[PDB]
Design an enzyme around this catalytic site. Structure first.
Site: not given
Ligand SMILES: NC(=O)C1=CN([C@@H]2O[C@H](COP(=O)(O)OP(=O)(O)OC[C@H]3O[C@@H](n4cnc5c(N)ncnc54)[C@H](O)[C@@H]3O)[C@@H](O)[C@H]2O)C=CC1
Ligand SMILES: [Mn+2]
Ligand SMILES: NC(=O)C1=CN([C@@H]2O[C@H](COP(=O)(O)OP(=O)(O)OC[C@H]3O[C@@H](n4cnc5c(N)ncnc54)[C@H](O)[C@@H]3O)[C@@H](O)[C@H]2O)C=CC1
Ligand SMILES: NC(=O)C1=CN([C@@H]2O[C@H](COP(=O)(O)OP(=O)(O)OC[C@H]3O[C@@H](n4cnc5c(N)ncnc54)[C@H](O)[C@@H]3O)[C@@H](O)[C@H]2O)C=CC1
Ligand SMILES: NC(=O)C1=CN([C@@H]2O[C@H](COP(=O)(O)OP(=O)(O)OC[C@H]3O[C@@H](n4cnc5c(N)ncnc54)[C@H](O)[C@@H]3O)[C@@H](O)[C@H]2O)C=CC1
Ligand SMILES: NC(=O)C1=CN([C@@H]2O[C@H](COP(=O)(O)OP(=O)(O)OC[C@H]3O[C@@H](n4cnc5c(N)ncnc54)[C@H](O)[C@@H]3O)[C@@H](O)[C@H]2O)C=CC1
Ligand SMILES: NC(=O)C1=CN([C@@H]2O[C@H](COP(=O)(O)OP(=O)(O)OC[C@H]3O[C@@H](n4cnc5c(N)ncnc54)[C@H](O)[C@@H]3O)[C@@H](O)[C@H]2O)C=CC1
Ligand SMILES: O=C(O)/C=C/C(=O)O
Ligand SMILES: O=C(O)/C=C/C(=O)O
Ligand SMILES: O=C(O)/C=C/C(=O)O
Ligand SMILES: [Mn+2]
Ligand SMILES: [Mn+2]
Lengths: 553, 553, 553
Positions: A47, A71, A92, A145, A163, A235-236, A258-259, A292, A295, A401, A446
């Site tokens: 279904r 449900r 997800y 975040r 998650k 998370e986030d 996680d991050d 930086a 992650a 992401n 991921n």
């Molecule tokens: N695929 C996976 O398993 C994972 C993916 N991520 C993704 O990584 C991304 C960042 O996550 P976090 O590190 O937690 O964030 P955060 O806020 O801790 O760090 C962001 C970083 O990106 C930099 N940044 C921003 N704009 C920039 C630009 N225009 N040019 C160069 N650097 C720039 C910032 O200066 C900062 O150092 C998110 O989109 C998140 O979804 C995070 C964890 C796991």
């Molecule tokens: Mn996350």
């Protein structure tokens, strides 16, 4: 169960719809409340897929499958089980991010716990309002975040919910032992404060000490009712709070982020699989991160632990890792700030100060590029071409992401490197066929490949704390499952279609690791860790709800 | 609590009667279901005592007070706490025994779980039928050896019920965390098998492997549902079964037998008290037991351990101990059987073979006589005089219960030895006044001083196994509370009126002992154990049932 | 049955005790919560009579059986049914009066709805807290005139409870459709105002408009939830409030006053039976009442109707009735007040005004004397002697309750009149045997012979209002069941031992009367009123609680 009659159908944890057998209906007071027809879970799945096939947008599919969880829980997971690869993007990343930015428009029923700054002092009473008596795993966010979408406030409750679905769909963790949590201390999102559908407090984020106290009061309340060893997954959370809370509680509770940590493991696993094909001397391995943050630092710290375990001193390894953020390249004495965690990778400025990430790649000449900035298509065609020119087989990870914030697409990475790059991304991309017949199936770097398996292991072993070493062992457990044939395809990770068996296997390996290092306390120590884990996974098959009737001698 | 309305009053666990405050009644749906009057627990207490004082027979007082446990739990325990000393003989021995022999005539509501041989293979479903979710302690019996009353089958359920009340009354163990259990595999009591009010299965005892497996099934069911750490106290099991099960399970579960080990610590604690009087060395004291069953063997073994702890070796200690059972003096090569546990105390036949127990006393000339044969007035006048002529300060313990099966009375022993005997009995005896106006207050050598404090410690420390060494420290802990003044009055034990503080004090010692010996698994280990245990005892005061109401900012 | 598990045992409505079958135990989640023994109601009954036999005082027996009602409702009525005659004195008058005097001393669990003046404006909220959904009969009291005991405040709740027990035990009215109610506006009883156990409001009675408004509110709240035809029986209200409330509501609700109308019917029925042993000419009937309140006026007016139904006019019949209260004979112009209701029975002062009731007996020379003063033994020996000399077969009715308030005993009546009188009393007296051997069996003129049957008929016919005509008919229906033999024993009423059959017969005749006079609104109209009533009487035998389990073709 305790109750009978209508209540059984109103509660999704027990509702089976027309799969309630005739005897169950008669003995549990359901006769007449259900259509005469008796169904199997298989008919019900049909279904579902029948109706899903006819739907048009991912969001519409999300609302529908997610509604099933409210449900009929058993069927909800039977549905994910049937095809986790095709539904992953829906339940997800990336669709979950879409759902979150619109959480207030599609709300139907709430899911999980909401603890706001306005409840400070009364958090324990909120935790006692949760129906389930034996919660073993909590995933919490304050929504600052959400993926690369930034601050979405309480609209971020969508992430913890997603998650946990994976805790059960991937690692067999009992859904009734899972609790999604959202900490609302306000939101800096100007648009949301103007949305009449917003679900949180209409105030900017409280960043004072009351915030830390709220978090403190939450950790205390959760463990008091469910146990000191309750797995708490952060998370986030924003960058600053993420590291701080992780270091403040990691030795006090059974918690991880996680991050920062799950990401580190998946990324490392990808680099390990890569080294299998490249086989290059680690002295020639130079890494460069775009971004930086959480992650990047987490990934870099685990890469260092890997290099150290492989010879290099900690100081020699860190010199092999560079970072480029929003203000530019991280070098000593630069105008922009540098936190305590970034310093270790902040090196003496090279010959020239690269103005763009492209210059950085040409100047530093890295062999591996890892995008984790959540800022869009920054791994430009020139970046990819520069990389392909500098390296015979460049490693290119675009982990941001959701899909729109990714640094580049699989299609861009493979064509611009003539099929030489080793690519991985955070959001899903389908196969790529080059104008010359070559097909490259990209892998998904991921953290979903890690947190389910790790969580299962830790819960089953009654672990009290999680050291960075667990994630390292998880990394090795993931990539150790890659067969050579899947390597040929261009896969740096086991197929997503096998995510369940892959997670169990990671759980087994981590449980073996926890016991062997005196980190497990579940006595007696199981003789066969494999048989032990598999034996305790929750199944989506309907359980008989009939009372134990029998004849006395 | 999850419910509101009448159910709150129908469940004794929550019912407060007129003690529900006005605000509780309005918000919970009780307005009008209770009289306009708002009472205090203090007033309820008075009503009780007013009615009890009018009551004439002990059994009548039993029915009344035990009825309160099924109407207002909190009040029940407040009532005991009011005057444990005088109520002890009613809820506990000897009246509890009277209740058991008549359990079927005074039955109103059942208490605890009943698992019968006829439920074999379906025991887990019975355990799941128990309302409480967090059971930490179980007291179970099969009614084969109820006090010195014999085989009473299911009528023996009264014992586990009585025992658990003390867990709470004395040591503050949460009532909802307690579970009394009766294993019914039939009974050999010919009379009960003819009584129309018998509450058990009409068949003689099943002594086959099925009995063994039933017990096995029960241990597995309880542990599986509440945790393998759950304390299982075996009570009043027949001789054979008592030992074998103890040996079989003390290694696998957190169990112990009260009739063997609890008694051992009480009797030993008594002797330790005697020493501070006689000062008599350990190279001294020649002990003779009347009966060689569960308690004798248990006391013997713990005595030996204390001597071995003070220089003496096990071989030379066991020789200072003699036992005389229903078959005469236990000597090597005698006609009567000699089990493995008795071998260590079965010495070479003396120059002459004691025909009766009085003879064994003259020939062997013991300095300490211990009766635990549940057979009656066997510590006859002659026996007592003999102990007088042979000793200056003879030790006479008639621990058999109930009253009519005790070896001698407090008066009989004190008057017949001109007040030089050091006495203790299993059942309570009022103060004795001699013709010379000398007054002696006899202590009660009953395990009630032991199992509560030990149970609290085991549970609080998350202990997985109970070693006899825990009991040795239990004895020391008890005696370490006997003040000098109390020694004088003729008290070998702390006043029964202080059994609460005594138990808490004991519990503290044992938890420190358990941790100090790496037997505790409750993390983090508490700095201040005293503060730790007192903070966790259940109180009989009423708790507010009001929902957490408060204003938002 | 919508509930399973412990709740089934905690609720007396469903609690079967060991009578729950094995099948029900397994299917309802009771296995293990009850002893292995399966009993029948017959066995439980035996257990009850066995214990009752031992008990010494009536109050003790009262506390015991009333406790059963709170544990196993089915068994409670089985016990009552088994010997309603001997238990009557314990559950009803006179012991129920004793219980009310001590209600706060013997309190264990509340019974009924308690509405206090402090609750004005929220009475509907109280009524909605009552657990039962389909209430059909309420019996309410304010406790100002409990029997001849006076103002007992909330301690009077025992009366409504006792009356409702008889609704069921006598007329088969459903327990769960009866609602005892106590209206509390304070009490004037000084003793209770200083009783720490008193269950009501600590204030004197509120007699302002608020009282009346509270009752109005009550009447509206009850009917609003259960229906405008909910039978509402007023019980033991003060004299001023009894008549006024009956007058104010008898045309707006389905209500009646037990004390004014029920009494009237039983008393008259007693006279009707008397006339069959005297055949005295109506013109010779001379009736004098001791007292002129609720009961007296009620009986007078009913007597007046019977006489008017036989020719005599109201005026002439009314002059055959004299009354004497606490101020003396009611004669026009006397200084003591004479309300509107008393006027028709207030004559012109005779030649000489009788100072004492004895002077009234000799002066007026009545042939019937009826005591309803609730002031004790006012029918002194001189009074009884005077009646013996004026009349050959003097009619003496000592209706005041309880026994201490009766005007005279059975022994005193028969002995002093040498067996020439026709006696009846409100409270029970055993048989009387004169020295000459003759035995006399006194009848009990208590409203218990009326309200059960009358209420049953009024309920089954969906009657909207009750007229005095109904009671005139009940009166006739009761005495018509008297058999000569019984009348020859000195019975003016049918054997109490058969009050079940008698009640049902009254119910039948009354239902036929209600329909015949178009007062019954139950449609369609039953063809056979007898089979209609007998089919609807509730039974005490256990019902199966098993779910409907059947196989499909
Ligand atoms: N695929 C996976 O398993 C994972 C993916 N991520 C993704 O990584 C991304 C960042 O996550 P976090 O590190 O937690 O964030 P955060 O806020 O801790 O760090 C962001 C970083 O990106 C930099 N940044 C921003 N704009 C920039 C630009 N225009 N040019 C160069 N650097 C720039 C910032 O200066 C900062 O150092 C998110 O989109 C998140 O979804 C995070 C964890 C796991
Ligand atoms: Mn996350
Ligand atoms: N804090 C806790 O976990 C407590 C558990 N218990 C009881 O102990 C029993 C388990 O006995 P053991 O043989 O020691 O445990 P186990 O060997 O079955 O598993 C060890 C731990 O992992 C958890 N677990 C098992 N399967 C799980 C799943 N599929 N998803 C999430 N968590 C899962 C269990 O709750 C347990 O705490 C349970 O039935 C429970 O009622 C009682 C008190 C506390
Ligand atoms: N092995 C265990 O017993 C575990 C218990 N938990 C959870 O921890 C919660 C309690 O907090 P913790 O700091 O772990 O324990 P705690 O330090 O407060 O006490 C330790 C143990 O003693 C029990 N306890 C405390 N007072 C008791 C009393 N007065 N009577 C009877 N039992 C009593 C508790 O249930 C607990 O199992 C429980 O609700 C439980 O769900 C979680 C993991 C393991
Ligand atoms: N006060 C306390 O703390 C405790 C008191 N007791 C009481 O001690 C009595 C026995 O308990 P268990 O050792 O468990 O019983 P058991 O059945 O294991 O031992 C009974 C022993 O007494 C002997 N015996 C029987 N009749 C005898 C007679 N006529 N003359 C001499 N010896 C005789 C038997 O041979 C047997 O060795 C019971 O009445 C029991 O209530 C038991 C445990 C603790
Ligand atoms: N769960 C519930 O609330 C149920 C309510 N009902 C009610 O019963 C009515 C249908 O009429 P029948 O029951 O067939 O009977 P009926 O129509 O022959 O009886 C007439 C009236 O007498 C009452 N009655 C019958 N026996 C009684 C007794 N033994 N004690 C006290 N009151 C009694 C009934 O409530 C009914 O209002 C409906 O008005 C319906 O509301 C019937 C079943 C269940
Ligand atoms: N057996 C039955 O079926 C019933 C018996 N009664 C009993 O009748 C008694 C009175 O009931 P109600 O009429 O409701 O009371 P009430 O308070 O309405 O009237 C009592 C009457 O007795 C009079 N009285 C008081 N003391 C007197 C005295 N010393 N000498 C002469 N007359 C005196 C009062 O003046 C008043 O007229 C109560 O004891 C009550 O238990 C009431 C209803 C039914
Ligand atoms: O049930 C829904 O679809 C929406 C509910 C709401 O707006 O709260
Ligand atoms: O016989 C029974 O099961 C109940 C007796 C009582 O409640 O007294
Ligand atoms: O005093 C009370 O409220 C209750 C007493 C009892 O249930 O015995
Ligand atoms: Mn025992
Ligand atoms: Mn009355």
């Amino acid at each position: 169960i305790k109750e009978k009659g209508k209540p059984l159908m109103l509660n999704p944890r027990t509702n089976k719809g027309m799969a309630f057998t005739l005897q169950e209906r008669q003995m549990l007071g359901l006769q007449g409340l259900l259509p005469p027809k008796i169904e199997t879970q298989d008919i019900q799945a049909l279904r579902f897929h029948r109706n899903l096939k006819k739907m048009t947008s991912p969001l519409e599919k999300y609302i529908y499958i997610m509604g099933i969880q409210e449900r009929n829980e058993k069927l909800f997971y039977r549905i994910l089980q049937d095809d986790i690869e095709s539904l992953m993007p829906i339940v997800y990343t990336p669709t979950v991010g879409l759902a979150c930015s619109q959480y207030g428009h599609i709300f139907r029923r709430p899911k999980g716990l909401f603890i706001s700054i306005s409840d400070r002092g009364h958090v324990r009473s909120i935790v006692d309002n949760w129906p389930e008596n034996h919660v073993k795993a909590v995933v919490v966010t304050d929504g600052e975040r959400i993926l690369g979408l930034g601050d979405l406030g309480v609209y971020g409750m969508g992430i913890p919910v997603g998650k946990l679905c994976l805790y059960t769909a991937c690692a067999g963790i009992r859904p009734d032992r899972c609790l999604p949590v959202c900490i609302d201390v306000g939101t800096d999102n100007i648009a949301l404060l103007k949305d009449p559908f917003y679900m949180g407090l209409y105030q900017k984020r409280d960043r004072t000490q009351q915030y830390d106290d709220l978090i403190d009061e939450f950790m205390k309340a959760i463990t008091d009712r469910y146990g000191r060893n309750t797995l708490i997954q952060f998370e986030d959370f924003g960058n600053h709070n993420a590291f701080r809370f992780l270091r403040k509680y990691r030795e006090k509770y059974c918690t991880f982020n996680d991050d920062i940590q799950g990401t580190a493991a998946v990324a490392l696993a990808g680099l390990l699989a890569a080294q299998k094909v490249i086989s290059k001397p680690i002295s020639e391995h130079k890494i460069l991160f775009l971004g930086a943050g959480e992650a990047a630092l987490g990934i870099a710290n685990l890469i260092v632990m890997s290099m150290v375990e492989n010879g290099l001193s900690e100081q020699e390894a860190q010199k092999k890792i560079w970072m480029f953020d929003k203000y530019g390249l991280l070098v000593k004495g630069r105008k922009a700030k540098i936190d305590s965690y970034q310093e270790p990778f902040t090196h003496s400025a090279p010959e020239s100060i690269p103005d763009t990430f492209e210059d950085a790649v040409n100047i530093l000449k890295p062999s591996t590029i890892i995008g984790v900035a959540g800022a869009g298509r920054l791994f430009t065609p020139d970046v990819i071409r520069a990389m392909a020119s500098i390296n015979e087989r460049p490693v290119i990870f675009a982990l941001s992401n959701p899909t729109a914030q990714a640094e580049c697409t699989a299609e861009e990475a493979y064509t611009l490197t003539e099929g030489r790059c080793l690519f991985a991304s955070g959001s899903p991309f389908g196969p790529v066929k080059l104008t010359d017949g070559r097909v490259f199936t990209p892998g998904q770097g991921n953290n979903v490949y890690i947190f389910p398996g790790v969580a299962l292991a830790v819960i089953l072993c009654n672990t009290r704390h999680i050291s960075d070493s667990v994630f390292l062992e998880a990394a090795k457990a993931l990539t150790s499952q890659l067969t050579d044939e899947e390597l040929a395809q261009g896969r740096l990770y086991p197929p997503l279609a096998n995510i369940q068996e892959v997670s169990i296997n990671i759980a087994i390996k981590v449980t073996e690791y926890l016991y062997a290092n005196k980190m497990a306390f579940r006595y007696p120590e199981p003789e066969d860790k494999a048989k032990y884990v598999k034996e305790r996974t929750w199944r989506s098959e309907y359980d008989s709800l009939l009372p134990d009737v029998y004849e006395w001698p």
